[PDB]
Amino acid sequence: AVPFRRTSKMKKRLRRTHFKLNVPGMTECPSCGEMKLSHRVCKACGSYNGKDI
Amino acid sequence: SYRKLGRTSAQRKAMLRDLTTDLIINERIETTETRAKELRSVVEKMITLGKRGDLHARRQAAAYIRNEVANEENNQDALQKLFSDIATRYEERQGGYTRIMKLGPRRGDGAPMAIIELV
Amino acid sequence: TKGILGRKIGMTQVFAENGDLIPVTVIEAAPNVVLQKKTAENDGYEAIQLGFDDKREKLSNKPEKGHVAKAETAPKRFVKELRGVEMDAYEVGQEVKVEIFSAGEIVDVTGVSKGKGFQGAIKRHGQSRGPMSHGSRYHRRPGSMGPVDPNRVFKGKLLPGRMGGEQITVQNLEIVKVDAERNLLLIKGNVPGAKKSLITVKSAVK
Amino acid sequence: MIQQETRLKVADNSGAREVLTIKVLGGSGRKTANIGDVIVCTVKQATPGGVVKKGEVVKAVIVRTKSGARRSDGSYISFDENACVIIRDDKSPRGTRIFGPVARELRENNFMKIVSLAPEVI
Amino acid sequence: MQKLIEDITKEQLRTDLPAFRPGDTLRVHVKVVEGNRERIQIFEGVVIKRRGGGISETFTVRKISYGVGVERTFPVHTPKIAKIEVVRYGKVRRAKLYYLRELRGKAARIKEIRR
RNA sequence: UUGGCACCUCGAUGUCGGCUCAUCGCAUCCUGGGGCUGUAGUCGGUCCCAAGGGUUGGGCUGUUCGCCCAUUAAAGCGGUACGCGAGCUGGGUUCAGAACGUCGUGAGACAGUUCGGUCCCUAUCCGUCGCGGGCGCAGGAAAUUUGAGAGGAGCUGUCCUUAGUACGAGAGGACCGGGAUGGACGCACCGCUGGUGUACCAGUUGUUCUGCCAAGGGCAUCGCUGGGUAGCUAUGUGCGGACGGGAUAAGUGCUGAAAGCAUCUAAGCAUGAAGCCCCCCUCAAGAUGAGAUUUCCCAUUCCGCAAGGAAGUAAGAUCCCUGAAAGAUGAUCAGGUUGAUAGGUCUGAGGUGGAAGUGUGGCGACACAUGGAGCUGACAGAUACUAAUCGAUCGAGGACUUAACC
């Protein structure tokens, strides 16, 4: 229940390949321009689907 | 199916019940999205009861909702508000009494919050 | 040899000139259509395709549209391929229906089992559990992995995994009834798979 | 769905009242035997010293259960207890009468003797 | 699709039947076969249970015969049943009378209603 | 096996038995096929080929083993650290306590006994079971597929007939061949039976709360009790292991010489098993040997002498979103505004069982009618009411040589 050997740098990195972050699904705010998540609200425009809250 | 929300039956009922009352009062609230998804059904359901307006429905909805104020200067409660105001609002609509606009996540949870409305 | 393919709906009971119940499975096979007619000269074996759907054009694609437009029909969703049948009988654009069969023909049917998910050794492989008392800290577990000498674990040792979703056949079933007006088959018993799922029926491989 | 170490009651004028099961006379390992089936048994409660006696090994036939039986027509039948009848190295009984109702599955198996002895068959 | 099921099973459904309730005494003239000599048999008892939909509807009748409790379940729409006939309805507060399984001896009695 | 020797291990290789999990050998327990018989038949004995599959549940004992009861076609012998303790138990052996017998002056001791006595570890690598991503497969894509090759399955009784025939003096009682029905095992499924069913229904107790009655809510294991849809389920249902082919084992032989005969053998021919390869089922082109078929897209722009590179795209796919028949997550599948993907709404099914209010009768508890009522989570049918918006990203331009058509 313990490592029989110490893990090398190479395998450490090979494991940490997939350990990463994809970017968001991004879109502009057509109202005031800046970027935004898809299907979500522009925090700065305060707008969504051509409608302000 | 239906969700559990990391709670027991009793305390999720209490959650949803409080939230229904809070939404009836404020006509808009910010929560998590999943909680909103689970509200949407029961909330439109109580609105059906309001559209009925019968006393049987009054007593059902009273069994569900909580005894809070919804409008000072009127001594009004959530239940009276529900039936009178909201049924007078939605005589004509057949379901879909809500909107769920997704917001981004939260700082502490990373939890996707979202607002919910009465449309 | 013969065959058809449709979609499962559900199950019910049916009598047979008696009080004798029949647990029945219900299938709708809207008239399937031929799409391609393979040969040993080009395809290396004799066989045909069959389509079962009427999709939307918003869902289909150009190559599908051409591949069916050889025939005078619409894009299809469930397309599969029969083997070892009479070839001269069939043609392209040719529809096949339930009145092939009758109310006593035996059948081998085929489908896709339900998805049970990542389940354990017992439910997946029918193993026995350990005792739930007498001091045991062992139950619902798969067992030993093997002996010591080979310093390893043999293949085929059975373990948890995604139970379900397998292509399954069931042999020697019996057709009970047909409703060609509704494009329906009523088969004695039960089949693999969930409702709304594809089911390929075949003359039984006796 | 009786099995070994089931305690049944007898339905004849043989002298036994309660009985216990040892085995189902089926195959290698048969777990259960609903009705029309045969078993090996011992007497546990009996009358005064009539024919059959305490702690005596016999074999017997099942005539009713509450793990009811099924029929090809979907007509099922279950009773409120689990009872049996004793035989003589053969499909014939030894008790001269029968107490209680019986099922029709004892004609599939050829216990028509018992069927005739019965008051009622269902 | 259950619409479709009903559409295809309406033929085997029946219309000769009365309405009966869980808890009412009832005879049934079921058919039997012994040696190619068809006969009938009268099972007269009380309805413990009724369930199911359409053709799969099923119901259970309980009786006592020679001191022994008996239950006999039938699907509703058999041709095998020649007939059923109520003798008395019953004032009962339930749908499934599994307590009568346990009880007997003039406590397993049902107050008639004269519907 | 009892052992002998002390070669690894005392900076630790956990030791009996049992549970789960199996696996291998065959000197085969059953099933299959045969020879011989002091084989009449039925049953048997012995030997040969065969390891495909199967090879019980209990009592006593810690036990292995063994005896016993009842079954079974049979209740096989062994190996795998007397398989398997980072998988379980820990009853026994084998710590410390105490006791009996016995020995000892005594402290104490006994393969003598008895009672009681802490079983740790988040799995790094390989391995195994499942699941994804990346790249490749001389252009890019959507589908269907071949099958090398792999795995699975592979058991068996009883009854009827043949026929009470053959055999037998009789008792008794067949081979073969037909047919039916079961056991165990496995696969699938929930229409039945039943179970479960914690956002369904009803009843009911105590307390408390909604100002009070009525009606209801909270807590009390879901408060308890009686039912219970979907789904998941077995004990329930359906189905299977059948038909058969090819080559063989032991065996049987035909023809036939060497060896004027005989000879199953050297030449040459044929039979012949639950076994081998197939037939049955499943996976399968990473089968780098990367396959085949059908259909779609076109062969653009910039540099760069060319080599080659990037930079917008087509077909198409994805991000993202609604969701489940799917699911740990990815994935898969159905859908994404000319659409029913989910929710909601309305119809229903099914379940519960006759709501609240009102009235009547009753002192009252309560009953009757209104009224198969009211309520209802996932079930299916409609319905564009709500949310699946607007976007964005990736994705081809198709090397050379040779042969044939041209």
Which pair of structure tokens corresponds to residue C88? 């001269």
C-alpha dihedral over C122, C127, C129, C130, to 10 degrees?
Answer: -140
Q: Which residues, at least 6 apart from C104, have a Cβ–Cβ distance to it below 8 Å?
A: C174, C175
Whether CB of C85 is under 7 Å from strand F: the answer is no
Per-residue exposure over C91-113, b if at least 16 CB sit within 10 Å of its own CB, e if not:
ebeeebebebbeeeeebbbbbbb
Give the whole-angstrom CA distance, residue C3 versus residue C204: 9
Q: What is the largest CA-CA distance in chain D?
A: 45
How far is Cα E83 from Cα E28, in angstroms, rounded to an integer? 6
Closest among E64, E59, E56 to E100, alpha carbons compared: E64
For residues C73 and C35, give the distance between their C-alpha atoms in angstroms, rounded to a whole number: 9
Please name the method used to determine this structure. cryo-EM
- Residue D59 CA to F69 C1' — how many Å? 14
Give counts: helices (H), strands (E), chain A: 1, 4
Cross-strand partners of B112: B105
Site from A21, A34, A37 to mutate, B interface, most B CB atoms within 10 angstroms: A37
Q: Looking at beta carbons, which residues of chain C come within 8 Å of D72?
A: 19-21
DSSP class of residue C129 equals P
Pull the structure tokens for residue E57: 């509807």
Would you state the structure tokens that stand for residue D80, as one six-digit string? 């409120």
Longest dimension (CA), chain C: 71
Partners of E65 on chain D (C-beta within 8 Å) are 100-101, 120, 122
**Rounded CA gap, C121 and C100, in Å?**
43
Q: Please tell me the number of Cα atoms within 13 Å of D8 on its side-chain side.
A: 33
Q: What are the residues whose beta carbons fall under 8 Å from the beta carbon of C83, sequence distance 6 or more?
A: C45, C46, C47
Count of domains in chain D? 1
HSE-CB for C205 with a 13 A CA cutoff: 10
In chain E, residues 2 through 31 whose Cβ sits under 7 angstroms from any atom of nucleic acid strand F: 2-3, 19, 21
In angstroms, what separates the C-alpha of A30 from chain B's closest C-alpha?
17
E32, E67, E101 ranked by CB distance to D100: nearest: E67
Which contiguous run of DSSP H or E holds residue C122? helix C121-125
Comparing CA positions, the residue from C176, C171, C206, C165 lying closest to residue C191 is: C171
Resolution (A): 2.9
B73 CA – F340 C1', rounded, Å: 45
D80, exposed or middle or buried, with CB in 10 Å at 0-12, 13-18, 19+? middle
For residue D74, the chain C residues in CB contact (below 8 A) are 13, 19, 21
Q: Report the distance separating Cα C132 and Cα C122, nearest Å.
A: 15
Cα C154 to Cα A24, C123, C145, distances in angstroms: 44, 21, 8
Contacts of E31 in chain C (CB under 8 A): 19
Helix (H) or strand (E) holding B49: helix B33-52
Strands (E) across C156-197 are located at 161-164, 167-179, 184-188
CA distance D86 to D97: 11
**C-alpha torsion sign, points B42, B47, B52, B53:** positive
- Provide the token pair at C96: 């096949």
Chains A and B touch (3+ CB pairs under 8 A): yes
CA distance D64 to C68: 63
B-facing residues of A in 3-42 (CB < 8 A) are 37, 39-41
Cβ atoms of B86 and B47 within 8 Å: the answer is: yes
CA E54/CA E52 separation, integer angstroms: 7
Q: From CA B111, how far away is CA B6, in angstroms rounded? A: 14
For chain B, count helices (H), then strands (E): 5, 5
Distance CA D14, CA A40 (A): 85
The helix-helix angle for B33-52 and B55-64 (nearest 10°) equals 160
Are the beta carbons of B101 and A53 separated by less than 8 Å? Answer: yes
Q: How many CB pairs under 8 A join D and E?
A: 57
The span from the CA of C161 to the CA of C120, in Å, is 7
Q: Please state, in angstroms and rounded to a whole number, the distance separating the CA atoms of residues E59 and E75.
A: 6
- Listed in sequence order, the residues at least 6 apart from D61 whose beta carbon sits closer than 8 Å to its beta carbon are D36, D37, D38, D39, D84, D85, D86, D87, D91, D106, D111, D114
Q: Which domain holds residue D121?
A: 1-122
- The SS3 assignment for D115 reads helix
| Six-digit token string for D107 | 């004609």
Residues of C (139-198) placing their beta carbon closer than 7 angstroms to any atom of strand F are 141-150, 152-174, 188-197
E75 touches chain C (CB under 8 A): yes
Task: State chain B's maximal CA–CA distance in angstroms.
Answer: 45
On whether any CB of chain C is under 8 Å from the CB of D76, the answer is: no
- Are chains E and D in touch, 3+ Cβ pairs below 8 Å? yes
CA distance, residue C50 to nearest chain D CA (Å): 38
- Protein-covered nucleotides of chain F (CB closer than 7 Å) are 19-23, 54-57, 69-75, 80-81, 83-90, 121-133, 141-147, 151-152, 157, 182-194, 198-199, 210-211, 215-220, 222-223, 226-229, 232-243, 280-283, 291-297, 315-317, 319-328, 334-340, 343-346, 348-357, 368, 372, 374-381, 383, 385-392
Is the CA virtual torsion E13, E16, E21, E27 positive or negative? Answer: negative
Give the whole-angstrom CA distance, residue C29 versus residue C6.
Answer: 4
Other beta carbons within 10 angstroms of residue A51's beta carbon come to: 11
SS3 C123: helix
Residue B56's nearest nucleotide, by CA–C1', is F356
Give the sheet arrangement for strand E58-65, strand by strand: D76-79, E68-75, E58-65, E38-51, E24-33, E81-89
**Of chain B residues 33-52, which have a beta carbon within 7 Å of strand F?**
33, 37-38, 40-42, 44-45, 48
CA angle C31, C32, C38 (to 5 degrees): 155
Q: Chain E partners of C12 at a C-beta cutoff of 8 Å? A: 5, 9, 55-56
What is the β-pairing status of strands D83-86 and D7-10?
Answer: parallel
Diameter over CA atoms, chain A: 61
Element (H, E) at C96: strand C95-96
**Nearest 5 degrees, angle CA B66-CA B117-CA B9?**
45
Residue of D nearest to E65 (CA): D101
Report the DSSP pairing between strands D38-46 and D57-64: antiparallel
Residue B46 is which amino acid? Answer: M
